[PDB]
Design a protein around this ligand. Structure first.
Ligand SMILES: [Mg+2]
Ligand SMILES: [Mg+2]
Ligand SMILES: [Mg+2]
Ligand SMILES: [Mg+2]
Ligand SMILES: [Mg+2]
Ligand SMILES: [Mg+2]
Ligand SMILES: [Mg+2]
Ligand SMILES: [Mg+2]
Ligand SMILES: [Mg+2]
Ligand SMILES: [Mg+2]
Ligand SMILES: [Mg+2]
Ligand SMILES: [Mg+2]
Ligand SMILES: [Mg+2]
Ligand SMILES: [Mg+2]
Ligand SMILES: [Mg+2]
Ligand SMILES: [Mg+2]
Ligand SMILES: [Mg+2]
Ligand SMILES: [Mg+2]
Ligand SMILES: [Zn+2]
Lengths: 134, 258, 36, 181, 49, 142, 49
RNA sequence: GGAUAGUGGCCUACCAUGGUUUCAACGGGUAACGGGGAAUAAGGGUUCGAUUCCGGAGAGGGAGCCUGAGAAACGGCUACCACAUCCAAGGAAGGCAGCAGGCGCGCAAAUUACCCAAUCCUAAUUCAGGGAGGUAGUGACAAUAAAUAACGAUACAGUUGUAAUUGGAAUGAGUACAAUGUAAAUACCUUAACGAGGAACAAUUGGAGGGCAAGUCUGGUGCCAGCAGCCGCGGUCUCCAAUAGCGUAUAUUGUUGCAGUUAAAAAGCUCGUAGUUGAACUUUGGGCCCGGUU
RNA sequence: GUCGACGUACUUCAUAGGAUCA
């Protein structure tokens, strides 16, 4: 005996035992209860819109440093302040205060990067293929 | 739905019609008639997709309105008239007569017949009952009501109906050793001899049928149609004589004839 | 203005057709094998 | 609406695209047979995998099993017809022993090279895509065309081709006209 | 922007474009809505009539 | 360098394949209920001609009654026998000496050390058993 | 998520807003004058010569 | 008994006290239309299925009906609830979850196109009608095949590599007589005549690694090291992967077969209902006959 | 109120061992 019923007519005890024990899994619990998106950085979304409050590392002396590429952004969905990466200081010129920035998951502690500014791809602006509409 | 349906999607149409699945979206819905919907071949499919006389539905309508097509000796003009099993289709201009018989594969086969054999048909007696004024009558599988039958005629027997008068010429009793034709199920189109009838009161009767190759199969009684005595069919049978052939033997025969 | 290719890195002509690039790579591989 | 039209993928990414040995083998195959990209090799690998899986499944069945006999005979017939499988090797065991290179061999590009019409496999591909090669009485412009045993003997320059007896191409008559002027 | 509406005019008859697409253009303008812009919402301006 | 090797690609090992069986391979086949012949035909989709050398056989006979099952499976007539011309009865050294000598064999083993030392040698497909069935490592034709 | 934007103030009056300025811009001879004539006829049923 | 097309607590009147349930009733949740099917997996299993077919329900939300064989119909009617159009203010007319096309934001995506020529459907009916349906147009949905060069000579550099070197042969992207195609067109397949050397008829998406200065910043066991370097006195580069496709972000329990002394988990002990499970025994053996396979 | 408990989500600390050589 393994501590589990084995009789040919004991199907029900096995099913009811399984259904009760399946809730132990954190993955299972999150999936059915729809709580798997609390841990998501954006609260379930793949991208986040934000307002550029300030360019923190604008005054850093060393060019192209990690600090120079960080911007403090307000998430419009909830108003929480977060920090985002820009691909390079050259791209930082495009970003200025009080524009919409679309953020995506990525100086430890910075977990976001800017992918679109003012509704235009930041990569496109860097490649000189578009103009930022103001 | 709020009433009878009037459309038939191509995918939902009977398989044995062999309709192209990409030619269109709809298929001919057989109108109400002697035969059931799923067990009938509308004249449009017969004239266009089998004989290839007409290229499209409009030409089929042109043919029918000319009154060249006769079903069972009567002119029909409905494109979707449900012709079916044991119905005689006469095209006088072509001097052609056809009897609709399932081939071994289970599909209606273009079988050409002589005029004399076209003069009659066979019908399975579905019902024997007294009508009004005490007049006995028989209802066959094609919905023909024939009054004053021979008293010995009982249900499941076969009656040879002359198309000109619509009267019974002769009849065959359903008995062991009789030649029968399968008209439903996976054994559709096969021919054999009765061996034994299992009876189950309040249930579906079963009939054991032995083929000429001595292979045996069991079929529900509703799908059996007596067509004559062994070796003496009352109608001309299509090619293959209702013998089911294995895939390997079919390959061998095909390679040989080619 | 028309193509709007912007700034892109300089790319060798062989990239334009993969077949030619693979041909050249295979020939170079045979030459290197002759040394091995 | 109209009934669906079936579609399918003719290739699948390998389990391990990043194996160095696999990269080297792909390089060798592409160079030897002048293949444009890795998609062709993946396609042929997918087909060969399908045939070999079917051969395994048929072998699993008992011998004389009617499905085994019929399907094995059909598969061996097809493989022999397409030329991959030789006449003397008509057994499912030898079907299971096939390799990708055999399928690449039957490609019309390789056959056109071998018969002597082209000086390179790449020249054969260019000739094919330029409508110079005809199988039988028919022009074929597809390098991946798989040549059957019967059709291998009928590969030739197309009648309409300048190399097949037609008039000179645009360049030739253009230069001739300029010289005449 | 991607998907921007672009209207097509074929020819000129009697110094007028075809009626049908002018209907399309007229309806499109009618239901149009305009964004709030920083400059135009912070200064007063007037086009001389 | 062996002429059967194109860079890291062995252009000699073609179906039907020749496969050397290591001692530990048999148990992990037994623990997983994987038939030796069908297991290989399944992983590689080819006919495989199993080969067992004397040294591995000598190891198996030494094991004792506990491993009688592996022994009789080892003596299956479908398993061909390889003669050994070297004194040492160690199996790992014998196998690698064979693959070094001629580049046609698949090595069937699960020993990490032997697997690593095979991995260093080029053009030697390495096969193992894990999970539910066999796995082939360095074989492009798959 | 795409519904979110930077908050802004629109100063357009609640009642009796001004007519919207439509600028017809294009290279010379492209048909600016005729387009204006075609539109004004539709909206007002009168043609401005 | 009434009603129903008809059986029936379907409803009425009188009667009895019954009906379901730990073998889970009743109640609650359901980002629940059901199925054929789709994905994955070695097998067991796990998930998806509004969506080409079948069946059910609905036409903004409830309620109720005429007609007719067939409707509780909504591109039929009537009220109420909510919206909302015209108005001379007395009144009138509404239902796109049909095809196009709009709004729902201040951030966005198929044409208010052509035809009944094929499919079949409706009618008094061969003919009329059919946004059902077909045809074409339009974001690389998902899929197939497949161009962007091939063969030579010369030159330069350490028998290999490099050409804004050089020769005459081939060809379709595109343009276009014509014809085919189609209801009429477009397109495809054909094809006169044009259409290639930077073949400028100018293939892309990612990653990796350099080197340079009278240049700039920072730190120090001198001349150095780190960061990095579109900026200097004047003056207006290499390689790797995929390939007509490529990148980024989020998401993505053990029946077979788990464990419970020492690092998840054995209840303080016993009794005990449901549930699961539960010792052995009843015609075995023997002697002949027939026809089948390998 | 930089309050308590719980739930949820994350961060963090505990990795070296044998042999040879100098
Ligand atoms: Mg025990
Ligand atoms: Mg009954
Ligand atoms: Mg030509
Ligand atoms: Mg003007
Ligand atoms: Mg719902
Ligand atoms: Mg569902
Ligand atoms: Mg569904
Ligand atoms: Mg309804
Ligand atoms: Mg609505
Ligand atoms: Mg209603
Ligand atoms: Mg309706
Ligand atoms: Mg409507
Ligand atoms: Mg609509
Ligand atoms: Mg549509
Ligand atoms: Mg009349
Ligand atoms: Mg085109
Ligand atoms: Mg009990
Ligand atoms: Mg017992
Ligand atoms: Zn040995």
């Amino acid at each position: 005996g393994k501590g589990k019923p084995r009789g040919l007519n004991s199907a029900r005890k096995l099913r009811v035992h399984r259904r009760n024990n399946r809730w132990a899994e954190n993955n299972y619990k999150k999936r059915l209860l729809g709580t798997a998106f609390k841990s998501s950085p954006f609260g379930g979304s793949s991208h986040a819109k934000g307002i550029v409050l300030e360019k923190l590392g604008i005054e850093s002396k060393q060019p192209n440093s990690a600090i120079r590429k960080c911007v403090r952004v307000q998430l419009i969905k909830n108003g929480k302040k977060v920090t985002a990466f820009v691909p390079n200081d050259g791209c930082l010129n495009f970003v200025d205060e009080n524009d919409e920035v679309l953020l995506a998951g990525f100086i430890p502690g910075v977990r976001f990067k800017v992918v679109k500014v003012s509704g235009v791809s930041l990569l496109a602006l860097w490649k000189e293929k578009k103009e930022k509409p103001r | 739905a709020r009433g009878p349906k009037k459309h038939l999607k191509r995918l939902a149409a009977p398989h044995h019609w062999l309709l192209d699945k990409l030619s269109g979206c709809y298929a001919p819905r057989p109108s109400a008639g002697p035969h059931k919907l799923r067990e009938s071949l509308p004249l449009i499919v017969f004239l266009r997709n089998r004989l290839k006389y007409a290229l499209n539905g409009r030409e089929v309508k042109a043919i029918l309105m000319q009154r060249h097509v006769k079903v069972d000796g009567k002119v029909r003009t409905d494109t979707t008239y449900p012709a079916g099993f044991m119905d005689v289709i006469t095209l006088d201009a072509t001097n052609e007569n056809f009897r609709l018989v399932y081939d071994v594969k289970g599909r209606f086969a273009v079988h050409r017949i002589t005029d004399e054999e076209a003069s009659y048909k066979l019908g399975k007696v579905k019902k024997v009952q007294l009508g009004k004024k005490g007049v006995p009558y028989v209802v066959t599988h094609d919905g023909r009501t024939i009054r004053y039958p021979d008293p010995n005629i009982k249900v499941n027997d076969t009656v040879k109906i002359d198309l000109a008068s619509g009267k019974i010429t002769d009849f065959i009793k359903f008995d062991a050793g009789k030649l029968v034709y399968v008209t439903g199920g996976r054994n559709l189109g096969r021919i054999g001899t009765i061996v034994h009838k299992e009876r189950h009161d309040g249930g579906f009767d079963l009939v054991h049928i032995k083929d000429s190759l001595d292979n045996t199969f069991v079929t529900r009684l509703n799908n059996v149609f007596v067509i004559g005595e062994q070796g003496k069919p009352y109608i001309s049978l299509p090619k293959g004589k209702g013998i089911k052939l294995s895939i390997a033997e079919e390959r061998d025969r095909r390679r040989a004839q080619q | 203005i028309l193509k709007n290719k912007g700034l892109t890195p300089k790319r060798n002509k062989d990239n334009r057709n993969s077949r030619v690039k693979k041909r050249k790579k295979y020939q170079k591989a045979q030459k290197k094998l002759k040394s091995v | 609406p109209r009934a669906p039209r079936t579609y399918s993928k003719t290739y699948s990414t390998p389990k391990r695209p990043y194996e160095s040995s696999r990269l080297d083998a792909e390089l060798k195959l592409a160079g030897e047979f002048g293949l444009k990209n890795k998609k062709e090799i993946y396609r042929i690998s997918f087909q060969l995998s399908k045939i070999r899986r079917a051969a395994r499944d048929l072998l699993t069945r008992d011998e004389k099993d009617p499905k085994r006999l019929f399907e094995g005979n059909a598969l061996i017939r097809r493989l022999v017809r397409v030329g991959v499988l030789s006449e003397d090797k008509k057994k499912l065991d030898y079907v299971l022993a096939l390799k990708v290179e055999d399928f690449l061999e039957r490609r019309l590009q390789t056959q056109v090279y071998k018969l002597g019409l082209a000086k390179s496999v790449h020249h054969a591909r260019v000739l094919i895509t330029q409508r110079h090669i005809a199988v039988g009485k028919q022009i074929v412009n597809i390098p991946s065309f798989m040549v059957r045993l019967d059709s291998e003997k009928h590969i030739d320059f197309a009648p309409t081709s300048p190399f097949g007896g037609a008039r000179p191409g645009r360049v030739a008559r253009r230069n001739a006209a300029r010289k005449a002027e | 922007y991607q998907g921007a509406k672009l209207f097509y005019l074929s020819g000129v008859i009697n110094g007028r474009y075809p009626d049908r697409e002018i209907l399309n253009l007229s309806r499109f303008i009618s239901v149009m809505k305009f964004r709030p812009l920083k400059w135009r919402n912070e200064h007063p301006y007037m086009l001389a009539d | 360098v062996s002429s059967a090797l194109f860079f890291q690609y062995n252009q000699a090992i073609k179906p039907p394949y020749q496969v050397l069986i290591d001692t530990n391979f048999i148990n992990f086949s037994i623990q997983k209920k994987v038939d030796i012949v069908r297991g290989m035909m399944d992983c590689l989709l080819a006919k495989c001609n199993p080969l067992i050398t004397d040294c591995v056989m000598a190891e198996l006979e030494k094991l004792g009654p506990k491993y009688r099952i592996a022994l009789k499976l080892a003596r299956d007539p479908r398993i061909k026998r390889l003669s050994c011309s070297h004194k040492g009865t160690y199996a790992d050294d014998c196998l690698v000496h064979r693959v070094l000598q001629h580049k046609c064999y698949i090595v069937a083993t699960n020993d990490a050390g032997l697997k690593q030392r095979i991995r260093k040698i080029p053009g030697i497909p390495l096969m193992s058993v894990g999970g539910h069935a066999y796995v082939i490592e360095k074989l492009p034709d798959v | 998520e795409r519904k979110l934007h930077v908050p802004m103030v629109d100063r357009t009056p609640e009642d009796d807003p001004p007519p919207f300025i439509v600028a017809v811009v294009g290279p010379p001879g492209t048909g600016k004058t005729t387009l204006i004539r075609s539109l004004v006829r539709r909206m007002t049923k009168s043609t401005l010569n």
